[PDB]
Write a protein that binds this ligand. Structure first.
Ligand SMILES: CCCCCCCCCCCCCCCCCCCC(=O)O[C@H](COC(=O)CCCCCCCCCCCCCC)COP(=O)(O)OCCN
Ligand code: HEB
Ligand code: HEB
Length: 901
């Protein structure tokens, strides 16, 4: 049992400081990681001794604070377990930092390998004295192209003393890239020496660089290089194969087939996938890359003995989270019970082909193999291509299918109709057309005598830089991409449909290549059938332009459909998915949900604030009506997500557009289900959902349904992302409620009572929403680890999103705990804190996805320079807080319910 000695300063204030110092440290570390090499961020923060000092100090502070709080005399078992998870997790992390080592390994078909080469960099000294065969020492060094760090080292080896000092290093490009050449001074015994030492890249310490001297200490060796470590067993591989979606170079799967050789003289076989691993003898093997000649494999290995302590830690943390969320006592149930008491040739053919519904009804269902490897119904392909050519959804009364069919069959018209959109005056003037943009036409961009006017500009423009684009260059590259798309359509190379010939990898051919292959093949039968299809369909189109029956071309479309079902392989999707995809394209909810969300939120906020400004409660009818309406709209939303999941055949939260849709879903879930009792929570939640769907629909995000990267194919995709991105819903709800309670603070005029109880209830609602958000963020982060311990190769490596998730955990832990240290002001300080704290989450999402490098790039993009808009928004927030500060005095434990309380 602890006694209260002067050394026991342990009290919450010390935990808030420690968490603050830790958070600032990791932040500065992450920005150093960008302005200097990652080796400079391993230095100064992550591998620095004082960081381990902070870790042990934090553990001791957890023990001291729990002893001083009389946690064990009271029951509080849930808090004890939850909090003990941290003490374990930290122990496991320490064990891994001290005993666990990492390695990379290279293997070639038929090669046997029993040694692995470290990824860090070492300097090696060996001494031999005529007495004493060898002594050997290794020292780690943090120097490369971007950082220099003088080594100073004093050691005793043969038993005499030795010193080494190092100056700097130049990067001369003497063949091997830049053979690193470094200069050094030594003292051994009285002898003092000056020496030049050189290494190859991240490869073996070759003999040539190995440099040996024989003055004091007999004969001595010095080298600078990568270390090699020797396995007790041995490995051989006999395959590397990777499988790329049919019809595309996009790699779907990476595979190795591997045999394991040991005095268990029967070999043991295993096969390996990007998201699968091997465990043998205490070693774990993942698969990262492969030799560029596609017959060599690269593996990463982690002998991390701290695995099981950290996993038990994660299990304790999850059990504690569930326990505290269902505990009868504790903060969450107390706030729930509190809130329960409160009240709160043919140029006019457009119109001709507009009415072709009888044709398009079948045309929209012929499958096409997109260049991404996925098989699309032609409706989706037509939508994508036309919405890329013409920025408006409909070029004329023609829907996308009609205009696609028209520009396919009558290039002589549609290449001279103004449709290719442009948004730059300099581009239009350099083309010699009038200033009015007006969707320039395909024929206008090159001359019969000429080649292609923009060619000279794009070759100058594209390679320069994404980060300092110009209003001219942006539209130049964009219009070039659009013209390339149009050329693909006019050539017919996009209709990779008519055959499913089983010659290539599995790729479906386009019609002219189809005819060529059928002619190359003695399959004249197929050639003449395809010719009949072509002739019938073209004649039917001609008839439909000059008349109006269309049944001929519709029958030809039915013919190509039945040819699909006849010749196609296992790639053919069932008609159910085709129907689902066409429905999701026609009645896409995510474009329609955005505005009604915002407008309903605004009107409901106005109605509720009118009541709170007065001293009358809002009539139940209004709550019931808006609640049922929001619930119907939420059901429509979740059905939209369900259809995207079903048609994608993968979880619909994996490519940073879906992620925005799922954050919207989590935000609306928080308001509709959990906090349904309160009007202001529902208002804030629906407002958040609307705003984030609008941001997603700003057009920067790519919304089309693509196939998964191979790494993402793990089951953990369903649990890591879902919980992590659900956290942002509740945290954004906390942000919105913070702004709302600050406005309520402004309204307070000491004549009004309702305002006071309103703020007092909003504080608790914000607090419990923050509890839920934190818990989700913590659990999702750590489980994600359990997933990064299979995909990447280590469960924590201080990656740029890893560290910022931890920063967010730290900030919200500070905000939740500060209720223990700052009495009297509590509602206002908590409001301010819950408003400012959301900057950590906005950073962890946007900044880490765009403005910082890292491995978790599953949702990244090119960094546009930060808009001053956000700076003005932050200035507005800070001004609002300063103004609200004038009325902050309203203690938390007030008294008279109804009259107040
Ligand atoms: C000479 C050896 C003598 C024997 C010593 C054996 C060990 C005894 C027990 C040690 C007890 C504490 C002392 C150890 C300090 C551990 C240092 C942690 C820093 C660290 O490097 O952790 C990394 C990852 O772990 C992580 O990811 C941890 C995440 C950070 C902690 C998370 C805390 C829980 C969440 C809530 C925290 C509170 C809120 C924070 C805002 C390890 O990886 P590496 O890069 O070093 O490995 C690469 C080379 N193998
Ligand atoms: C997760 C998140 C979080 C974090 C990070 C934390 C972190 C912490 N924490 Fe915590 N906590 C929490 C969450 C948290 N936390 C909660 C939720 C609670 C509540 C519990 C109950 O309800 O009872 C607490 C509670 C608590 C308490 C009270 C209990 C008694 O009875 O006394 C204390 C003292 C604490 C401390 C602390 C510390 C020192 C730290 C540093 C490590 N904590
Ligand atoms: C598997 C593999 C992977 C891994 C390993 C991971 C790992 C991780 N992660 Fe992750 N994530 C992911 C995949 C992933 N991840 C995805 C896919 C997502 C969704 C999309 C995005 O990102 O957006 C996420 C998401 C996410 C989020 C939300 C935000 C965003 O989204 O941006 C967060 C916070 C995180 C964190 C994290 C952490 C801390 C970690 C460490 C453990 N993530």
């Amino acid at each position: 049992m602890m006694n209260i000695i002067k050394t026991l300063f342990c009290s919450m204030k010390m935990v808030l400081l420690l968490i603050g110092i830790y958070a600032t440290a990791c932040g500065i570390a992450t920005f150093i990681e960008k302005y200097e090499g990652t080796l400079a961020a391993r230095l100064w923060v992550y591998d620095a001794f004082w960081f381990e000092i902070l870790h042990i100090w934090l553990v001791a502070c957890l023990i001291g604070c729990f002893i001083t709080s009389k946690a064990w005399q009271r029951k509080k078992y849930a808090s004890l377990l939850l909090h003990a998870s941290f003490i374990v997790i930290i122990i496991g992390a320490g064990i891994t930092r001290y005993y666990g080592f990492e390695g990379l390994m290279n293997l070639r078909e038929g090669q046997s390998v029993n040694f692995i080469s470290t990824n860090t960099h070492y300097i090696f000294i060996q001494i031999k004295n005529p007495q004493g065969d060898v002594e050997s020492v290794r020292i780690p060094t943090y120097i490369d192209e971007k950082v220099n760090h003088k080594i100073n080292q004093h050691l005793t080896f043969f038993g005499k003393p030795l010193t080494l000092h190092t100056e700097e290093f130049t990067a001369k490009q003497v063949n091997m890239s830049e053979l690193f050449i470094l200069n050094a001074s030594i003292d051994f015994l009285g002898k003092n020496e000056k020496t030049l030492i050189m290494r190859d890249g991240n490869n073996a310490p070759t003999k040539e660089n190995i440099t040996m001297l024989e003055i004091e200490g007999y004969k001595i060796f010095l080298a600078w290089g990568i270390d090699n470590i020797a396995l007790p067993f041995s490995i051989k591989l006999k395959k590397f194969e990777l499988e790329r979606y049919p019809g595309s170079n996009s790699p779907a799967s990476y595979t190795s087939e591997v045999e394991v050789l040991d005095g268990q003289n029967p070999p043991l076989p295993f096969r390996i996938f990007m998201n699968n691993v091997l465990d043998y003898g205490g070693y774990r093997f993942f698969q990262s890359s492969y030799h560029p000649d596609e017959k060599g494999s690269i593996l990463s290995v982690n002998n991390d003995p701290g695995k099981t302590p950290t996993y038990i830690g994660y299990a304790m943390l999850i059990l504690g989270v569930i326990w505290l969320l269902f505990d009868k006592n504790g903060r969450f149930a107390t706030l729930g019970r509190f809130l329960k008491t409160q009240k709160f040739d043919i140029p006019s053919m457009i119109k001709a082909l507009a009415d072709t519904s009888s044709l398009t009804n079948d045309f929209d269902r012929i499958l096409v193999q997109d260049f991404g490897g996925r098989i699309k119904p032609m409706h989706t392909l037509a939508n994508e291509y036309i919405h890329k050519l013409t920025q408006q959804r409909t070029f004329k009364g023609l829907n996308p299918s009609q205009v696609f069919l028209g520009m396919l069959f009558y290039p002589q018209e549609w290449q001279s109709i103004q449709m290719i959109a442009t948004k730059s005056p300099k581009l239009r003037q350099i083309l010699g057309l009038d200033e009015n943009q007006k969707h320039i036409a395909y024929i206008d961009v090159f001359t019969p005598q000429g080649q292609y006017i923009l060619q000279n500009y794009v070759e100058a423009a594209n390679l320069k830089s994404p980060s300092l684009r110009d209003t001219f260059e942006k539209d130049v590259i964009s219009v070039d991409e659009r013209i390339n798309y149009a050329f693909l359509i006019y050539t017919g190379q996009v209709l990779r449909i008519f055959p499913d010939n089983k010659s290539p990898n599995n790729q479906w051919l386009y019609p002219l290549q189809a005819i060529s292959s059928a002619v190359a093949q003695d399959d004249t039968k197929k050639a003449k059938e395809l010719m009949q299809i072509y002739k019938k369909f073209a004649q039917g189109m001609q008839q439909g332009i000059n008349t109006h029956n269309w049944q001929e071309a519709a029958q030809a479309t039915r013919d190509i459909r039945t040819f699909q079902q006849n010749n196609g392989g296992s790639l053919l999707i069932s008609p159910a998915k085709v129907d689902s995809e066409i429905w999701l394209n026609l009645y896409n909810p995510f474009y329609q949900l955005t505005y009604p969300y915002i407008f309903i939120s605004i009107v409901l906020f106005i109605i509720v604030l009118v009541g709170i400004l007065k001293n009358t409660p809002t009539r139940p009818l209004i709550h019931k009506v808006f609640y049922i309406l929001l619930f119907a709209l939420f059901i429509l939303h979740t059905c939209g997500l369900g259809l995207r999941w079903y048609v994608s055949e993968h979880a619909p939260w994996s490519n940073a557009y879906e992620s925005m849709l799922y954050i919207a879903w989590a935000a609306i879930l928080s308001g509709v289900v959990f906090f349904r009792r309160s009007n202001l929570a529902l208002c804030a939640s629906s407002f958040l959902a609307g705003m984030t769907l609008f941001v997603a629909n700003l057009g920067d995000m790519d919304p089309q349904i693509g196939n998964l990267m191979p790494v993402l194919k793990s089951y953990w995709l369903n649990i890591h992302v879902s919980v992590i991105t659900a956290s942002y819903g509740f945290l954004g709800l906390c942000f919105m409620l913070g702004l709302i309670t600050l406005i309520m603070f402004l309204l307070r005029n000491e004549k009004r009572s309702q305002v006071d109880c309103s703020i007092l209830s909003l504080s608790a609602l914000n607090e419990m929403s923050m509890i839920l958000g934190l818990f989700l963020l913590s659990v999702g982060n750590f489980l994600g680890g359990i997933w990064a311990n299979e995909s990447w190769g280590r469960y924590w490596g201080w990656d740029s999103k890893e560290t910022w998730a931890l920063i967010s955990i730290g900030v919200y832990a500070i905000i939740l705990h500060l209720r223990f240290v700052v009495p009297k002001n509590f509602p206002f300080i908590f409001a301010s804190a819950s408003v400012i704290g959301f900057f950590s989450v906005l950073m962890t999402y946007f900044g880490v996805n765009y403005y910082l490098t890292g491995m978790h790039s599953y949702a990244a993009g090119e960094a546009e320079p930060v808009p001053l808009w956000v700076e003005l928004m932050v200035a507005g927030i800070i001004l609002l807080i300063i103004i609200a500060s004038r009325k902050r005095v309203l203690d938390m434990p007030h008294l008279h319910h109804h009259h107040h309380h």
